[PDB]
Symmetry: C3
Subunit: 451 residues, 3 copies
């Protein structure tokens, strides 16, 4: 059950009661498609049903030709060199590309083809060492050699029935689409499409993964999230086997507390126009308890939320001491230096929270919260304020209409004096772009000594 608290002193709000699901590692799985080496199509026929099989066979041959141009290139994701700019930089698919390099080595391909001879699903120990679960999803070699073979290799082609022309177009379409996606994605796609892996196959891949029963239940009830956080890496096409690597999210952190810290600018409301100072907490984002520290996601838009569960990637996190949470109840606590910025602003805005809305209303801006049946129900005055989503349908700031989340949950309004009122405007360090409480303090004592 979700709850929420607003801190009038620091113009922020925390939504509590969420559960974690943090991508920590990667499970690399091999997907294979058995092909037939169709060098040529010896058939003169002008028969309409043969003409359509030759057309679908050219697309197949062209798809193979297209895919060979891709396996000859090293696939790669290109990465860099409020607080998101402090984030580390990691190669997102370095594990999958390492496995893709193993599939290029001679004989390694033959190991895969042989393991999937009797079953379409088997575990394989690779030459380098990593144990991967291989799965054959399409046996076009078998189909062509059993249905389309008598029509090729003979100049006098035995004309096929209409249902084979249609069924071949059906089976071949998957290969053409897998090729279509790799052709515009430089051999690396994400999310993984239902052509790379159908919902049927994905679930079957999950239930056979070396993971706990908790994780199997979790990934299956959130397959749409698994796809968005997965990659499909084109690998090899040789010796009648097309292989592409699928990289699936591992959730090493599950069911730990998560909260979302919302922040908005806190300014003075003096009638004198330029005499106002401002202060804004920059530690907003998702927080989840994680191994005695707190995983901090400074760009909450990167996480994905399903009901009350939060799906994030630790690649988008900073690892903070748990004391960072003291900034919500006491931004002046002596145990963690709470981050703020102090660029002046005279613009109004609202932040829609999980169960309410923060309103930073300044200047001459109209700021209200309304109900569809009753119109305006609260009028915000200058400063930073909050309203609960109970009985409220919309919030308007200026010419911007916000809808509030109608999620069920109790909100708590923690009254407090705006901390912006404690500072003398004559010695306030404005335009600190990425500072903190202590940094402002020690800059104030330096400007006071100079005076």
């Amino acid at each position: 059950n979700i709850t929420e608290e607003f801190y009038q002193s620091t113009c922020s709000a925390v939504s509590k009661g969420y559960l974690s699901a943090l991508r920590t590692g990667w499970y690399t799985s091999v997907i294979t498609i058995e092909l037939s080496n169709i060098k040529e199509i010896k058939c003169n026929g002008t028969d309409a049903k043969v003409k359509l099989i030759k057309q679908e066979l050219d697309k197949y041959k062209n798809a193979v030709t297209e895919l060979q141009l891709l396996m000859q290139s090293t696939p790669a994701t290109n990465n860099r060199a409020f607080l998101g700019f402090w984030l580390g930089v990691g190669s997102a698919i370095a594990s999958g590309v390492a496995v893709s390099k193993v599939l290029h080595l001679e004989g390694e391909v033959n190991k895969i083809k042989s393991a999937l001879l009797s079953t379409n699903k088997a575990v394989v120990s690779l030459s380098n060492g990593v144990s991967v679960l291989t799965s054959k999803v399409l046996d076009l070699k078998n189909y062509i050699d059993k249905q389309l073979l008598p029509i090729v290799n003979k100049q006098s082609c035995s004309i096929p029935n209409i249902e084979t022309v249609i069924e071949f177009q059906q089976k071949n379409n998957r290969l053409l689409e897998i090729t279509r996606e790799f052709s515009v994605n430089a051999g690396v796609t994400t999310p993984v499409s239902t052509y790379m892996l159908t919902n049927s196959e994905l679930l079957s891949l999950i239930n056979d993964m070396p993971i706990t029963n908790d994780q199997k239940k979790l990934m299956s009830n959130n397959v749409q999230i698994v796809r968005q956080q997965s990659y499909s890496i084109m690998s090899i096409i040789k010796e009648e086997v097309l292989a592409y690597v699928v990289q699936l999210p591992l959730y090493g952190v599950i069911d730990t507390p998560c909260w979302k810290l919302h922040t908005s600018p806190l300014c003075t409301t003096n009638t004198k126009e330029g005499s106002n100072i401002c202060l804004t907490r920059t530690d907003r984002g998702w927080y989840c308890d994680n191994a005695g520290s707190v995983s901090f996601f400074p760009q909450a838009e990167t996480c994905k939320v399903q009901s009350n569960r939060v799906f994030c990637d630790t690649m988008n996190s900073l690892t903070l001491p748990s004391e960072v949470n003291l900034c919500n109840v006491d931004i002046f606590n002596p145990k963690y230096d709470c981050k703020i910025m102090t660029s002046k602003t005279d613009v109004s805005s609202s932040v829609i929270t999980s169960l309410g809305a923060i309103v930073s209303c300044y200047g001459k801006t109209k700021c209200t919260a309304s109900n569809k049946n009753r119109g305006i129900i609260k009028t915000f005055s200058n400063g930073c304020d909050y309203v609960s989503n109970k009985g409220v349908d919309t919030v308007s700031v200026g010419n911007t209409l916000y809808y509030v989340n109608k999620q069920e949950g109790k909100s708590l309004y923690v009254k407090g004096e705006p901390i912006i009122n404690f500072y003398d405007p004559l010695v306030f360090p404005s335009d600190e772009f990425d500072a903190s409480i202590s940094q402002v303090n020690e800059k104030i004592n330096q400007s006071l000594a100079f005076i």
Copy 2:
């Protein structure tokens, strides 16, 4: 007719003569697909035409199974917690998700199925209250029960003709694609694809909307823009009816003046290398008059422009006093504090405007404007300059070639002394990341008192 003005004093340019089209509200509409509860397919047949119907029936059943995994999850868009970082934060699909929650309630589904029994287009008052326009686009229940029913439910299957196998694949493809998109988008897509709503159906949905005749004409002549600003929200699949919510843009603001303010860095050009100071207007973006204020879009790349009309979302806007426009003619006006930043830069760049190009040329950079038939026609000197797009095809700065817009329109070069020349470099507040004219002034008077 488009015009433009360049202010040599503040290194900026304003393109005038545009018309607004601002997304203010949302029109939620229900799209439905009548299905048949096909529990099983009792048929032993090895006939090729029956084998292909069983194959297409499995895809249908799997699509339903896939969609049920999605209706069991709460759909959500994940949002945050030059001046874009001052923007509010709103749930983009909170209205559609509220309607999606109403469709989950018992009996509410039966209301929809009954209203669309005789017509495929009807208005429905929901239990909560909002009046929504429901539209049935596919009756697969009717098709299967009228063409595919005699082949199932009988162990001795009456074999169907080839044209029914093909036509069933045709009709069923739309359902498989709608499912395909929701499966990789966590049940929320945007833009709305032609599978969610065909151009035929969208226009028919627009002409029946409760909106003015002006808005009907507007949305129809810009359907490609309507799609990009729309969402499709998976809702429910129960009682033989699949329902997904489509959220369409409401344009409460139309035909008001719009102008695009372009800005580029203004620096001194002293021969002494480190003695130079810089100044850059940070109020660039789209501006549109809106209800006595001015809607300001600080990230112009979010708006979409079609001929001389500007399509923006008020969710991406700040609401400023109209006096903000005084910064173009007089950046020192006493009625609005014009925003600037003062980080030093020695790099050159160009901004391609609607009818010309601004050039910030500094250091040893080659800056020219050429014509395809005649080569270089103007050579920029150090400082901030401008050239009109008449007779000019390209602008080069350093190793970067810019093409200019060949749009027709008159440009006006407003000569003026660069305001960067009015400041003493010895007491200039460099590296003000988000300041303003007054903030620089009062920081200069503080550094002068200390001296």
Copy 3:
């Protein structure tokens, strides 16, 4: 062969040994599809094979109707008005849109239709002047007039065979998909899909381009990259011809040296918590020698890397003096003012380089580098450090696991004192958001004079 160097003094690393491929200009090519003006389909027939041809003919007519709504609108890409925010602003498709405006003029269409009457590939001089290579990829007019004509125009329709219903659906699908993409992209797509241009046609378009043999070899071995950097611009549909403009990357810069500069924060490691100062190089990104200057891409994620070649767009570059490279060996050199920022940070992070990983480890964060078979092999201490990818599989910082690139190459650890140790914390300009070595120096001398 790739190499790399880490500078312990400035907490940065440079990967050397790459080759350039810089998009400088645009090659505009015209793609055409010959259509038939099918006003109406005079046929009463209830025959199943005729019903399916009427269905596929409606989709064709609707696709034309949809495309006419798009040619009536001016296509446009919407653009703006660490160091990426200093980048110029250019219209990405201004050249293609200029050609699209030429196709709208009367008689210009007839010139194209006539040039492609005998061949499906010919060069055309346009009325304005630019020489463009036109290519007809689909002749649906010929197909309908030769196979589907006897079934229309007659009330007593000669019923067609089943293979023509299927083949018409096959040929028509490309048109429906081209229309599908333009309908959700406001008539401008990128990357160019295989429906806009198949891998077969693209290569054929490349080999016939007016470019050097080096460039033909380059673009063909990297077709997946060409597509991602290409645009497809809907143009005209009139006089039985649909024309859309394809804009292809021109690589004026090839085979010049490229290096990727990685940077991470450099801080003091005093036991006193708030007494620490920090410094971070902001010149990270891709660098490539380019015409005696250096093209600098401050957002390395925009470039695309294939093996050891770097594909970038000069539109995403700044043109710097080559002396900028002196910041790697001597950040204090007197010939270029090296850019830094000095916002304090106490968070740890790692940057995965081409051949190793930088680790900025501060506070109480666990920072290690492990091997899959042997576990932790190095433990980082507070400060900024580096480890080579030889023998190392992963790096962990806090709760974040990074995989290292297993690329082959030698790394060089250039020992040096952290330059952050040279500054007195009592007069250090913290929170300089975009400064440089000289700017910090001259601000230190001003704070010292005040003291």
